[PDB]
């Protein structure tokens, strides 16, 4: 597996600025660049300044120009509760973390504790329609997307450039009355001082004494790096010349996996006339998605977390609920109205009213109106004919009524 | 096939003239101009090991 | 022989019909649709993902003045800051007090996770319904995939079947479609260039393996802190993450007619709307003369069980007296009942029990047995189960559930009023004629 | 000559005019214990007893009728149904009864003489004058009468004018 590790064998670690580094702010060797957390079951992929895996499980950090290392099992990090490092490759660590507001990666080399806290949100993303914080002991397996544990060449690349001129106060020094620049072993440097005129000079492994500039602060001593890379970071000065010099592919990309999702307790389903009731006892919070199987779906979507009772309406056109990670159960209504359709006319009205509510009211209203108009009109014509019978017989001064027209028209 | 460069001389990107463990300072200059090149991946893989 | 019928678009439920060429034996056709699809023409426009702000390293010059260079990167912001006094780990970086100059540079590029986690903005038009049929033409079965357009027949054993066009051009897909994470969302995304920050489309890209990406993410460079080297920026949080937080449920949860929105070709399956007409071209070699088949006389029907249920809630007995022993087809040509059987094997003498399903409370339908027609008449009773788990195996009618009591209370109160008003008219006419008749003498 | 005097002697106490702000527009009839009075003549009854009653209406036969009390039923007109053709007595002279039709010669007839009963040579009311229509030289009457069966027949010619 050297074929994909030697690319990060040609870079370096570096130091960069952190905000919270266990007392105030400082330059920390474990400065966190980015925390991408889009895998599902809690897998995050940090990018730091120190490198990893360079030897089996170790981390390789800069320390004031010189490069050290510790075993990886003395590095710890935590978001809100502690995390567990899985592996690392180059600048990138892979961890497993709960959710939190920040990340503090820390170790302790001597009795001197190194830390770095950055305010980057870590989020835990569940799979499925049922929202958990720690994945269950058992369930069913759905398609999920987590960061792949291996380190293979894929589409993504990050770019590493030349390092800038790192300055060094320790490199400048004093003679009896002089200023001496002592580069480290086998190392070139460039020196810039501004005490007399203007001086830009370069040394190559030569401890040079300057006769003028009789203060330490008059001179700035930089350091030269030529065979190494650093990441294109905003926390490092850039070198002269616009050469980017190359790029490397990242480990731990996101891939397609399989994750065990929990399974809700089954509901208790009670039926009514054109109705289905649901008694729901979730363990953890659980979405309930229902819709009708007709032209207007009237869908409903609700995150249920406590015990609930959800009375729905089911017509003869269908109904469908999804509860948790369970499949959709479909229900269909059939014609059971309250009443007897075969007699006792106060029962057939209630049967055809619970069957068809609007049409029964409309039909009984128009039939009662037709019957009312017919009875009123027939009574009107009866009174008209009784007046027309008895009008000629009452205007006569004899005032008599014959035998047939008396009783048949109630004349008396 | 892809032809990478180090000067005005084309060579196949699977057979580099130099390696990192032989000359470390010049492989970065070799990977300088070869970024806008479809065979940067093969050039880096060939510059990984000898 | 040309034969055209009309099957309702609903998978799972069987459909029976028989061909009646006159001088030959009736041939049963049973067609059960397994799966009904709806594939729209789908045209990719752009893809989107999370962004990744790339921050260039700060170029610092001591007692000088840097200059801004354009690079034409996506959403590329450049600003130069003067009077900065930077610190490294090993002391100060400059020696001057003022006149130091630093360039901050930032730009927006695609995430490293784009090949696995991204969404795709599509466009939909011109769906083509495609169906899986399980066809039984004269006790011979085949599984058949047919296109419902006005062409494209299928040919097996000389039988030719052309699924007619759907009665409805309805689709659950709107003009614009977003496919993300296997599910399909009916979203109205901005066009390639109209991407606004904070919402869906702030990063656009023509393909996943493209090279030219639009970015409008509202990026602003701020001033670095006094005594430090960093590039500070401030921009709007990701439109893709915000879309993921504010999703409506997908189209497999909100689409009407019970559509099942599937992924890999974008399609909707088993969506019960409309009706699919059919057409047959049957060779004469599959038919049979009548005299080689059981021709029957004196058949009578009585109803044993009658429940107007969604399943086959009726049982009827046909007492017959045929001429030979064999099978023949049974079919109800009306829409009152739907037979389960579609083929009843007969002896020379006996009874035949068939299973139907109806919605009439008082059924009266004209059943066809082998080449004759009987009349089954009974009364159905309501079921007791309120909710079932299978759909309705028949077709409802108007005045289907009206009882003979309800017809009596309609008729005796609706025509009886007319009887009362016409005897009022006859009484008024007789009174007018009598009173005018007694007036004539004077 | 003497016919108008006989009409004034028979219709003296039994005929009461209808007043309307001092104008005489109609005449009621007290016969058979019944008070006949038309619709179109509107006003107050000059008699105090007949005014404080309630008259049942008949708009088709154009008659209001009431019940005369028992202390006045003897002082009423007489009525009969047996009538031949020929001549009869009327307040302005004579009236001809031909083909079941009452005809009056012209010169007389205005607005106000509605409700005058038609008498005979014995003293019985045979018709009640309600309206009239001008026919050539000899006008026709629109009246009411009775018959042998007992049905009040209203005879009305074409295009009559109410008086």
mmCIF file of N, CA and C in Angstrom, chain C residues 435 438-442, chain D residues 61 145 147 153-155:
data_model
loop_
_atom_site.group_PDB
_atom_site.id
_atom_site.type_symbol
_atom_site.label_atom_id
_atom_site.label_comp_id
_atom_site.label_asym_id
_atom_site.label_seq_id
_atom_site.Cartn_x
_atom_site.Cartn_y
_atom_site.Cartn_z
ATOM 1 N N UNK C 435 -121.902 23.455 -12.939
ATOM 2 C CA UNK C 435 -122.428 24.779 -12.619
ATOM 3 C C UNK C 435 -122.752 25.558 -13.891
ATOM 4 N N UNK C 438 -126.153 23.949 -15.276
ATOM 5 C CA UNK C 438 -127.378 24.431 -14.643
ATOM 6 C C UNK C 438 -127.690 25.886 -14.980
ATOM 7 N N UNK C 439 -126.717 26.647 -15.469
ATOM 8 C CA UNK C 439 -126.913 28.042 -15.843
ATOM 9 C C UNK C 439 -127.592 28.202 -17.204
ATOM 10 N N UNK C 440 -127.528 27.179 -18.064
ATOM 11 C CA UNK C 440 -127.927 27.306 -19.465
ATOM 12 C C UNK C 440 -129.420 27.531 -19.663
ATOM 13 N N UNK C 441 -130.261 27.140 -18.704
ATOM 14 C CA UNK C 441 -131.700 27.219 -18.927
ATOM 15 C C UNK C 441 -132.213 28.653 -18.853
ATOM 16 N N UNK C 442 -131.811 29.387 -17.808
ATOM 17 C CA UNK C 442 -132.215 30.777 -17.518
ATOM 18 C C UNK C 442 -133.740 30.903 -17.370
ATOM 19 N N UNK D 61 -120.652 36.183 -9.154
ATOM 20 C CA UNK D 61 -122.047 36.556 -9.338
ATOM 21 C C UNK D 61 -122.312 38.024 -9.030
ATOM 22 N N UNK D 145 -131.099 36.549 -12.080
ATOM 23 C CA UNK D 145 -132.439 36.012 -11.866
ATOM 24 C C UNK D 145 -132.310 34.602 -11.302
ATOM 25 N N UNK D 147 -134.345 30.430 -11.142
ATOM 26 C CA UNK D 147 -134.953 29.424 -12.001
ATOM 27 C C UNK D 147 -135.791 28.479 -11.147
ATOM 28 N N UNK D 153 -128.815 32.611 -11.764
ATOM 29 C CA UNK D 153 -128.208 32.758 -13.082
ATOM 30 C C UNK D 153 -127.936 34.238 -13.316
ATOM 31 N N UNK D 154 -126.694 34.565 -13.668
ATOM 32 C CA UNK D 154 -126.299 35.926 -14.003
ATOM 33 C C UNK D 154 -126.202 36.054 -15.519
ATOM 34 N N UNK D 155 -127.051 36.897 -16.097
ATOM 35 C CA UNK D 155 -127.056 37.133 -17.535
ATOM 36 C C UNK D 155 -126.303 38.420 -17.842
#
